[PDB]
Design an enzyme around this catalytic site. Structure first.
Site, PDB file in Angstrom:
ATOM      1  N   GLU A 146       0.815  -1.209   0.000  1.00 12.75           N
ATOM      2  CA  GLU A 146       0.000   0.000   0.000  1.00 12.75           C
ATOM      3  C   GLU A 146       0.849   1.260   0.000  1.00 12.75           C
ATOM      4  O   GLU A 146       0.417   2.302  -0.507  1.00 12.75           O
ATOM      5  CB  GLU A 146      -0.945  -0.023   1.211  1.00 12.75           C
ATOM      6  CG  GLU A 146      -1.469   1.333   1.648  1.00 12.75           C
ATOM      7  CD  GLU A 146      -2.427   1.278   2.845  1.00 12.75           C
ATOM      8  OE1 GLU A 146      -2.920   0.184   3.216  1.00 12.75           O
ATOM      9  OE2 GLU A 146      -2.707   2.362   3.400  1.00 12.75           O
ATOM     10  N   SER A 155      -1.423   7.197   7.829  1.00  7.13           N
ATOM     11  CA  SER A 155      -0.055   6.701   7.796  1.00  7.13           C
ATOM     12  C   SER A 155       0.875   7.870   7.510  1.00  7.13           C
ATOM     13  O   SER A 155       0.573   8.715   6.662  1.00  7.13           O
ATOM     14  CB  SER A 155       0.123   5.621   6.723  1.00  7.13           C
ATOM     15  OG  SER A 155      -0.495   4.419   7.131  1.00  7.13           O
ATOM     16  N   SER A 190      -8.959   6.251   5.838  1.00  7.62           N
ATOM     17  CA  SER A 190      -9.720   5.884   7.029  1.00  7.62           C
ATOM     18  C   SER A 190      -8.957   6.290   8.282  1.00  7.62           C
ATOM     19  O   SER A 190      -9.495   6.955   9.171  1.00  7.62           O
ATOM     20  CB  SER A 190      -9.985   4.369   7.067  1.00  7.62           C
ATOM     21  OG  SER A 190     -10.499   3.876   5.839  1.00  7.62           O
ATOM     22  N   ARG A 228       7.691   3.994   7.034  1.00 10.15           N
ATOM     23  CA  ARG A 228       6.500   4.449   7.750  1.00 10.15           C
ATOM     24  C   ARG A 228       6.921   4.897   9.147  1.00 10.15           C
ATOM     25  O   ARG A 228       7.251   4.062   9.990  1.00 10.15           O
ATOM     26  CB  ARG A 228       5.465   3.329   7.811  1.00 10.15           C
ATOM     27  CG  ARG A 228       4.079   3.772   8.257  1.00 10.15           C
ATOM     28  CD  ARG A 228       3.146   2.577   8.412  1.00 10.15           C
ATOM     29  NE  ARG A 228       1.758   2.992   8.603  1.00 10.15           N
ATOM     30  CZ  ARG A 228       1.161   3.092   9.785  1.00 10.15           C
ATOM     31  NH1 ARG A 228       1.829   2.797  10.893  1.00 10.15           N
ATOM     32  NH2 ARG A 228      -0.112   3.470   9.852  1.00 10.15           N
TER      33      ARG A 228
HETATM   34  N1  LIG Z   1     -17.261   9.789  -1.427  1.00 12.87           N
HETATM   35  C1  LIG Z   1     -16.653   9.511  -0.271  1.00 12.87           C
HETATM   36  N2  LIG Z   1     -17.084   8.450   0.459  1.00 12.87           N
HETATM   37  C2  LIG Z   1     -16.471   8.169   1.613  1.00 12.87           C
HETATM   38  N3  LIG Z   1     -15.444   8.803   2.190  1.00 12.87           N
HETATM   39  C3  LIG Z   1     -15.039   9.845   1.447  1.00 12.87           C
HETATM   40  C4  LIG Z   1     -15.571  10.257   0.242  1.00 12.87           C
HETATM   41  N4  LIG Z   1     -14.903  11.369  -0.245  1.00 12.87           N
HETATM   42  C5  LIG Z   1     -14.002  11.606   0.674  1.00 12.87           C
HETATM   43  N5  LIG Z   1     -14.030  10.739   1.732  1.00 12.87           N
HETATM   44  C6  LIG Z   1     -13.106  10.774   2.855  1.00 12.87           C
HETATM   45  O1  LIG Z   1     -11.947  10.059   2.474  1.00 12.87           O
HETATM   46  C7  LIG Z   1     -11.657   9.023   3.433  1.00 12.87           C
HETATM   47  C8  LIG Z   1     -11.087   7.822   2.723  1.00 12.87           C
HETATM   48  O2  LIG Z   1      -9.873   8.192   2.058  1.00 12.87           O
HETATM   49  P1  LIG Z   1      -9.003   7.096   1.269  1.00 12.87           P
HETATM   50  O3  LIG Z   1      -7.680   7.749   1.013  1.00 12.87           O
HETATM   51  O4  LIG Z   1      -9.699   6.614  -0.009  1.00 12.87           O
HETATM   52  O5  LIG Z   1      -8.966   5.937   2.360  1.00 12.87           O
HETATM   53  P2  LIG Z   1      -8.910   4.392   2.174  1.00 12.87           P
HETATM   54  O6  LIG Z   1      -7.785   4.001   1.169  1.00 12.87           O
HETATM   55  O7  LIG Z   1     -10.232   3.913   1.690  1.00 12.87           O
HETATM   56  N6  LIG Z   1      -8.683   3.843   3.725  1.00 12.87           N
HETATM   57  P3  LIG Z   1      -7.251   3.064   4.167  1.00 12.87           P
HETATM   58  O8  LIG Z   1      -7.505   1.508   4.172  1.00 12.87           O
HETATM   59  O9  LIG Z   1      -6.932   3.492   5.591  1.00 12.87           O
HETATM   60  O10 LIG Z   1      -6.024   3.480   3.250  1.00 12.87           O
HETATM   61  C9  LIG Z   1     -12.963   8.782   4.186  1.00 12.87           C
HETATM   62  O11 LIG Z   1     -12.665   8.398   5.526  1.00 12.87           O
HETATM   63  C10 LIG Z   1     -13.624  10.168   4.169  1.00 12.87           C
HETATM   64  O12 LIG Z   1     -13.129  10.978   5.229  1.00 12.87           O
HETATM   65  C1  LIG Z   2      -2.487   1.323   6.865  1.00  6.89           C
HETATM   66  C2  LIG Z   2      -3.756   1.974   7.410  1.00  6.89           C
HETATM   67  C3  LIG Z   2      -4.979   1.096   7.166  1.00  6.89           C
HETATM   68  C4  LIG Z   2      -3.572   2.218   8.900  1.00  6.89           C
HETATM   69  C5  LIG Z   2      -3.635   3.501   9.426  1.00  6.89           C
HETATM   70  C6  LIG Z   2      -3.449   3.704  10.785  1.00  6.89           C
HETATM   71  C7  LIG Z   2      -3.214   2.614  11.603  1.00  6.89           C
HETATM   72  N1  LIG Z   2      -3.015   2.781  13.016  1.00  6.89           N
HETATM   73  C8  LIG Z   2      -1.675   3.088  13.422  1.00  6.89           C
HETATM   74  O1  LIG Z   2      -0.813   3.214  12.619  1.00  6.89           O
HETATM   75  N2  LIG Z   2      -1.365   3.266  14.813  1.00  6.89           N
HETATM   76  C9  LIG Z   2      -0.046   3.560  15.117  1.00  6.89           C
HETATM   77  C10 LIG Z   2       0.310   3.815  16.545  1.00  6.89           C
HETATM   78  N3  LIG Z   2      -0.829   3.552  17.592  1.00  6.89           N
HETATM   79  C11 LIG Z   2      -0.472   3.798  18.957  1.00  6.89           C
HETATM   80  C12 LIG Z   2      -1.353   3.515  20.003  1.00  6.89           C
HETATM   81  C13 LIG Z   2      -0.876   3.773  21.304  1.00  6.89           C
HETATM   82  C14 LIG Z   2       0.426   4.271  21.437  1.00  6.89           C
HETATM   83  C15 LIG Z   2       0.978   4.555  22.822  1.00  6.89           C
HETATM   84  N4  LIG Z   2       1.370   4.758  23.849  1.00  6.89           N
HETATM   85  N5  LIG Z   2       1.186   4.490  20.405  1.00  6.89           N
HETATM   86  N6  LIG Z   2       0.730   4.253  19.177  1.00  6.89           N
HETATM   87  C16 LIG Z   2      -2.153   3.893  16.991  1.00  6.89           C
HETATM   88  C17 LIG Z   2      -2.385   3.098  15.843  1.00  6.89           C
HETATM   89  C18 LIG Z   2      -3.138   1.333  11.079  1.00  6.89           C
HETATM   90  C19 LIG Z   2      -3.322   1.131   9.726  1.00  6.89           C
HETATM   91 MG   LIG Z   3      -5.716   4.072   1.358  1.00  3.50          MG
END
Ligand SMILES: Nc1ncnc2c1ncn2[C@@H]1O[C@H](COP(=O)(O)OP(=O)(O)NP(=O)(O)O)[C@@H](O)[C@H]1O
Ligand SMILES: CC(C)c1ccc(NC(=O)N2C=CN(c3ccc(C#N)nn3)CC2)cc1
Ligand SMILES: [Mg+2]
Ligand SMILES: Nc1ncnc2c1ncn2[C@@H]1O[C@H](COP(=O)(O)OP(=O)(O)NP(=O)(O)O)[C@@H](O)[C@H]1O
Ligand SMILES: CC(C)c1ccc(NC(=O)N2C=CN(c3ccc(C#N)nn3)CC2)cc1
Ligand SMILES: [Cl-]
Ligand SMILES: [Cl-]
Ligand SMILES: [Mg+2]
Lengths: 353, 353
Positions: A122, A179, A176, A191
């Site tokens: 990713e 990173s 969501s 990262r």
């Molecule tokens: N049409 C839409 N539907 C849903 N969310 C949207 C939309 N447009 C913008 N967003 C926002 O964009 C975010 C998702 O961004 P995105 O970069 O596509 O994440 P993702 O790749 O789906 N999640 P992740 O698995 O963490 O990488 C959502 O959490 C909303 O805050």
């Molecule tokens: C790749 C994507 C789906 C994603 C995005 C965010 C996360 N989430 C994290 O990347 N986290 C990293 C550090 N975390 C904590 C928690 C407690 C303490 C202390 N004390 N420190 N760090 C939070 C979660 C995963 C996948």
């Molecule tokens: Mg993404």
């Protein structure tokens, strides 16, 4: 086979599609009707079913890729509707896929017979996709931009920004969740950390607090709200600035902190709560990005992911906050193809297979 | 005049009171009845009006302070009820005061005639108060403690911790918001940063989401909840671990991220939302503390403020998270007199006046 790259996220699927425009006479005759119909369906429609969207304004025209000229298209739909996409795929191809759903839905993609799935990381795809789009430019315009004089609203305006020597770079991927990446070279990146307070937190909390039914409606509510109705500010605690540690009276001391009072909960509006949610999430992302930048010794911080699409509030808030709280040491940077870099980077993995 | 120190926070007023126990025969006769009645009221009651509480279990007995033996008492009440406290004060004294309300309510304290208010800094008092209480011990027991083997629940248990050479130290003050301090010596400390996601965010959001009417009820709800009903985990996105960056399937990817789905919003319970709020706030504090520790090169991180009183959930969560995410490099430390250090530090400023 058509040239796709796909980033299956927790919330959105992103798809980059390369439409060849140098199709020769022999090639046009020697293509199977299904290949023809796919290209036609994708380029003659901008809405696909009820939830697929082609972002026409992002199209890269007359791009040379893998020795062919074509147009690069950018398409998105909810991950929730991936079963529908896969079902259409089984009606009467090498798919480079990244994001968490390349693993989660691997077995589903293989229900499409004779389809070869190649999973790619990713964040390798993000880095490769970002550097590529910036290198080819946005149809001759800068892919990267910032907000000049972001401290001053009568002056604050979008301005292009050059990334010809793009290292080092802090990439803040707001999906969501979040990173955070430290990119030292084309081949050297890590990262640094992440946070779970991301786009999904904004949308989830907003839906709980205001009943909004879409991301766009959440932003519309927030644009009409006053976050200080819900937040406790430094001046609510001190009666003004906390001068000794340089905290202005207007800084948020406690997000949603005024909601501990029943009377304030009863008078706050949904728009106020939508705005406080946006401001809370956006400021926490900026603060985390700032601490990572200082620790990694990187002063260029680029924000990507779809939390910022059609979201000028959060962008301007990030531009202003990063500059103010870093005492002007860090620059907030943004990219026109915000959410699509992973999908592009996956597409670029195609020669490896 | 009675010996008080007062920390007027955004949410709670904290008061340290020194009860002399070596009152001589001449002294007892030569004390004015109002001084007598104050001492009697404070030491014969553990509830004051409807919202004042004396934390009897924290009392420091037979302490020598300013050359007198006495008992140090710890009293709290909501800042919202300070007008009542001040009104009682005008019925028929040098007050060292810190916290934001020492400035905000300065003019109110001067309605008490012939009362001299000396304002002291909220974080100088914290540092002085913390070092003092630890130095005199908690009636012979350790003031400082940690959770040994916090990674393993069958083993995790509170154990004392020695701070005889307490430098350097990262102090994480979780009030309404959060202040983070790097303490290098008794005289050398700085506020590294802060966050606005603090105790007031937990209480405010919880009240909005669940209708809880008290901090204690919010914690009670959270103890019965399952935060994974509201949060999107790494395994909800990947189908398991994200092995490449060492993210376990159980890590939160998006706080409240499952609340973007209407069907999940309709099935989540108030207890689930209370727990997700606590976990979201607690993890963000720990993550910020971790980044500051790494940047300041400090491996002892002590958490204070009243967000953690009667809150073993957040303490254990902080103990486990700090240790896990720092790969065992950082230790989470806690102090028995969690919320009172500013009030103590203010009391210690008394000789300066
Ligand atoms: N049409 C839409 N539907 C849903 N969310 C949207 C939309 N447009 C913008 N967003 C926002 O964009 C975010 C998702 O961004 P995105 O970069 O596509 O994440 P993702 O790749 O789906 N999640 P992740 O698995 O963490 O990488 C959502 O959490 C909303 O805050
Ligand atoms: C790749 C994507 C789906 C994603 C995005 C965010 C996360 N989430 C994290 O990347 N986290 C990293 C550090 N975390 C904590 C928690 C407690 C303490 C202390 N004390 N420190 N760090 C939070 C979660 C995963 C996948
Ligand atoms: Mg993404
Ligand atoms: N009885 C209580 N009433 C209210 N909040 C409580 C109570 N017990 C614990 N808390 C928690 O403790 C927090 C306040 O902690 P405290 O350290 O006293 O902050 P403060 O000094 O009032 N605020 P600040 O101005 O930011 O320093 C609240 O936000 C709650 O999360
Ligand atoms: C003293 C107490 C009442 C208190 C507690 C917390 C605060 N609040 C802060 O201490 N903050 C520090 C940094 N802030 C940001 C915001 C955006 C960015 C970027 N980009 N960086 N930092 C958040 C607020 C105040 C008083
Ligand atoms: Cl593969
Ligand atoms: Cl003064
Ligand atoms: Mg305080």
């Amino acid at each position: 086979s058509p040239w796709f790259g796909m980033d299956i996220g927790g919330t959105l699927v992103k798809l980059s599609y390369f439409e060849p425009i140098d199709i020769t006479a022999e090639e046009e005759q020697e293509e199977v009707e299904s290949l023809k119909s796919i290209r036609k369906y994708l380029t003659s429609n901008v809405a696909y079913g009820s939830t697929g969207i082609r972002d026409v304004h992002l199209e890269l025209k007359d791009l040379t890729l893998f020795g062919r000229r074509g147009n690069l298209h950018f398409i998105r739909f909810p991950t929730q509707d991936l079963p529908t996409f896969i079902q259409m795929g089984r009606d009467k191809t090498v798919l480079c896929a990244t994001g968490g759903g390349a693993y989660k839905f691997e077995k589903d993609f293989r229900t499409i017979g004779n389809l070869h799935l190649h999973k790619l990381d990713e964040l390798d795809c993000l880095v490769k996709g970002l550097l590529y789009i910036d290198s080819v430019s946005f149809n001759g315009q800068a892919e990267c931009y910032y907000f000049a004089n972001a401290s001053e609203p009568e002056r604050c305006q979008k301005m292009p920004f050059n990334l010809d020597d793009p290292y080092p770079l802090l990439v803040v991927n707001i999906g969501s969740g979040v990173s955070i990446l430290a990119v030292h070279s084309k081949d050297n990146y890590k990262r640094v950390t992440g946070t779970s307070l991301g786009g999904g937190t904004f949308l989830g909390l907003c839906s709980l607090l205001t009943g909004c039914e879409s991301f766009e409606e959440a932003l519309e509510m927030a644009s009409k709200g006053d976050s200080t109705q819900a937040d406790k500010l430094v001046r609510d605690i001190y009666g003004g600035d906390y001068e000794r540690f340089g905290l202005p009276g207007w800084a948020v001391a406690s997000s949603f902190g005024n909601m501990i009072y029943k009377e304030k909960r009863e008078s706050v509006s949904k728009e106020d709560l939508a705005r406080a949610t946006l401001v809370t999430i956006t400021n926490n992302i900026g603060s985390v990005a700032r601490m990572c930048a200082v620790n990694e010794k990187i002063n260029r911080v680029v924000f990507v992911g779809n939390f910022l699409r059609v979201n000028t509030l959060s962008m301007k808030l990030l531009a202003y906050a990063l500059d103010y709280w870093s005492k002007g040491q860090l620059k907030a940077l943004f990219l026109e193809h915000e959410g699509y870099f992973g999908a592009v980077g996956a597409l670029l993995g195609l020669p490896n297979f």
